[PDB]
Amino acid sequence: AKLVCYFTNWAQYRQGEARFLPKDLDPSLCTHLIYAFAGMTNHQLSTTEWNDETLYQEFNGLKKMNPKLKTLLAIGGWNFGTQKFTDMVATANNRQTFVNSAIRFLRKYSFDGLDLDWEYPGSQGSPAVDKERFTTLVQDLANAFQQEAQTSGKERLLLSAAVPAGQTYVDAGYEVDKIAQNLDFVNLMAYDFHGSWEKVTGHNSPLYKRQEESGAAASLNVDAAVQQWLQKGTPASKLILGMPTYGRSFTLASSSDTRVGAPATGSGTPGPFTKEGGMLAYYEVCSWKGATKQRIQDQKVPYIFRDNQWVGFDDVESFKTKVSYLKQKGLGGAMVWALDLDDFAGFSCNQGRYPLIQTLRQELSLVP
């Protein structure tokens, strides 16, 4: 089993106990640690924060403590958008520039691989031609990594990709069968199924559908996303089930209608540490004062409300349920977004450090 965990290079800017610093990294919590995010300049891999080089040395320095650990560098993410990917994959020449830059960069900073997080080929402004060009990029990287291993005698760089759960994005961007041949593993982003971009409440990461759902909505759940990627050609051993350590929040139209599917007027109030309306870290809801928590019966996940604020999130119980699920489906492991949104310092939830991610590690039988 794998436990793939994302580190984010902006968590260092949160205040107080929420500030995530190198001392908060645990070399043996996860099997694979992915650094979010690198960017791109002139079609070439590049840093995005002023101290990335300092953090790269910390990050890969964990491997001194746990020599089994593998690290990857992720390029892209939601905010990065698509234009730079589109421009880089538009020609073989530009892809070659990128691939060669990536190998040099990963070796320079001692990363064990690259995680592609383009959100997404064929969507978010990216043209339809990018579906096949993404296939080619994946093939180009895999083949070049194989070649460099032969030339250098070093262990081959890994290639993974973070991929969407929703059929609209999957079919617009991903030749699933083809890319599965070349990716070492596939990080399924089985979250953001619902959120405050919708005008009714819905859970960030439900395992199964609700009875009231039909049509496309009935596939906006973890089980459907997993089965989608498997049936479209991803080997189970390569499919890594993503898990969120955050929830998605809504302001209710009325505090007297708190159902799943109740009318919402927008994002929930920003969290005191995360300061982003529409999401909250686990540590911002795990002990939410004066709130009312219950479970969504068929979806196997909790929601919590307080006055006109409503939040769908994951807890220890839902993480256990999801690991039981992934094991039943024979998947390659779990992935988690993100280290810094769990109660990494044990300051809020009275459940110790990393209560959610330690649950994943325990349920996968990966405890040192």
Ligand X SMILES: CC(=O)N[C@@H]1[C@@H](O)[C@H](O[C@@H]2O[C@H](CO)[C@@H](O)[C@H](O)[C@H]2NC(C)=O)[C@@H](CO)O[C@H]1O
- Which residues would be at the binding site for ligand X (CB under 6 A)? 6, 77-79, 117, 119, 162, 189, 192, 246, 276, 279, 337-338
- What's the min distance (Å) between Cβ of 119 and ligand X? 5
Going 356 to 361 to 363 to 367, the CA torsion angle's sign is negative
Strand partners of residue 294: 303
Contact 308, 302 (CB under 8 A): no
- What's the min distance (Å) between Cβ of 308 and ligand X? 21
Contact 278, 195 (CB under 8 A): yes
Q: What letter would DSSP give residue 213?
A: -
> How would you label 324-339 residue by residue, b for 16+ Cβ within 10 Å and e otherwise?
ebbbeeebbbbbbbbb
Q: How many residues does the chain have?
A: 368
Catalytic position from the list 17, 53, 58, 119: 119
Nearest alpha-carbon partner for 1 in 318, 322, 361: 361
- What's the min distance (Å) between Cβ of 189 and ligand X? 5
- What's the min distance (Å) between Cβ of 276 and ligand X? 5
For residue 215, the one-letter residue type is G
The reply to whether 317 belongs to the active site is no
Which residues, other chains included, contact 292 with Cβ-Cβ below 8 Å and sequence gap of 6+?
258, 304, 305, 306
For residue 344, the one-letter residue type is F
Exposure on the CB side of residue 53, measured as CA atoms within 13 A: 4
166 annotated as belonging to a binding site for a ligand: no
Contact 310, 301 (CB under 8 A): no
79 annotated as belonging to a binding site for a ligand: yes
337 annotated as belonging to a binding site for a ligand: yes
78 annotated as belonging to a binding site for a ligand: yes
Per DSSP (E only), the strands in the chain are 2-8, 32-41, 44-46, 70-76, 113-117, 158-164, 185-189, 239-244, 246-252, 264-267, 279-281, 292-296, 301-306, 309-312, 333-337
- What's the min distance (Å) between Cβ of 8 and ligand X? 7
If you search the block for the tokens 């994946």, which residue do you land on? 138
77 annotated as belonging to a binding site for a ligand: yes
- By beta-carbon proximity to ligand X, the closer residue of 162 and 316 is 162
162 annotated as belonging to a binding site for a ligand: no
- By beta-carbon proximity to ligand X, the closer residue of 316 and 338 is 338
- By beta-carbon proximity to ligand X, the closer residue of 100 and 288 is 288
* R_g (Cα) of the chain, nearest Å: 20
Binding residues for chitin: 49-50, 76-79, 120, 189-192, 337
Binding residues: 49-50, 76-79, 120, 189-192, 337
Q: Which residues are catalytically annotated? A: 119
